[PDB]
């Protein structure tokens, strides 16, 4: 019963907590599990000038966006995960639940 809670997020320190919760509450029912397997972070990037024309010296703004991923791997029934997931998440992160 391989199940994969793949967490994608923009937040470094709300993610941390939502992946913790899933592992705090797996070992009380106690159903054996893999550990937090990360992925390589992406910085998208856009650059632009600052002005509404072409006047002045040419200065440059540089807008980033670090986009941060986790994943954790369960051996458990999917009805057991209906309970688990819906219990307590937060706005910073959205959760996927790969079933097999």
């Amino acid at each position: 019963h391989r199940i994969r809670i793949t967490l994608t997020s923009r937040n470094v320190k709300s993610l941390e907590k939502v992946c913790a919760d899933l592992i705090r509450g797996a070992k009380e029912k106690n159903l054996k599990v893999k550990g937090p397997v990360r992925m390589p972070t992406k910085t998208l990037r856009i650059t632009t000038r600052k002005t509404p024309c072409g006047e002045g010296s040419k200065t440059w703004d540089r807008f980033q966006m670090r986009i941060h991923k986790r994943l954790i791997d369960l051996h458990s029934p999917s009805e057991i995960v209906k309970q688990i997931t819906s219990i307590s998440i937060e706005p910073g992160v959205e959760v996927e639940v790969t079933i097999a």
């Binding site: 992406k42 998208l44 986009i67």
Partner: peptide, 19 residues
């Protein structure tokens, strides 16, 4: 949706919905 988009493309068309 049906055609299945990109996560970059997905996390950004989020931002433009909000604004």
């Amino acid at each position: 949706m049906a055609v299945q988009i990109s996560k970059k493309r997905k996390f950004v068309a989020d931002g433009i919905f909000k604004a």
